[PDB]
Amino acid sequence: TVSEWLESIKMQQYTEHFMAAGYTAIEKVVQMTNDDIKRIGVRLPGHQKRIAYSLLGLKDQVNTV
Amino acid sequence: GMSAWLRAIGLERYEEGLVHNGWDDLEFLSDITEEDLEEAGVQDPAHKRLLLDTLQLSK
Secondary structure, eight states: OHHHHHHHTTOTTHHHHHHHTTOOSHHHHTTOOHHHHHHHHOOOTTHHHHHHHHHHHHHHHTTOO | OOHHHHHHHTOTTTGGGGTTTTOOSTTTGGGOOSHHHHTTTOOSHHHHHHHHHHHHHTO
16 A cells, blocks of 8 residues: 555655545556656655655556566 | 764764655664665765664664
């Protein structure tokens, strides 16, 4: 679940904005590119990597049939 | 956070840098990688090695 991902990467406080931006489910979370990340409420350069890096994995993970 | 943590090694002045990346917690910072370090500004070899030392020194 999105919660486990967001909390494991210590992005706990983002879950709030994430779900609010319609990205409540993984399938939608793996869609949003880098732009969306910064828009939802990420101004920290560091968090812009913690989420992006991990997102890359998720996007690939769902592709690994 | 890792305030007193980095203090013992003399890296306290860096803290805030690893805060803007989400490593401001000894929950997952204790298992941080050398890759997830450079992003916080800790790109230097000596600095990375220093933090890795603290993982076993302070734990």
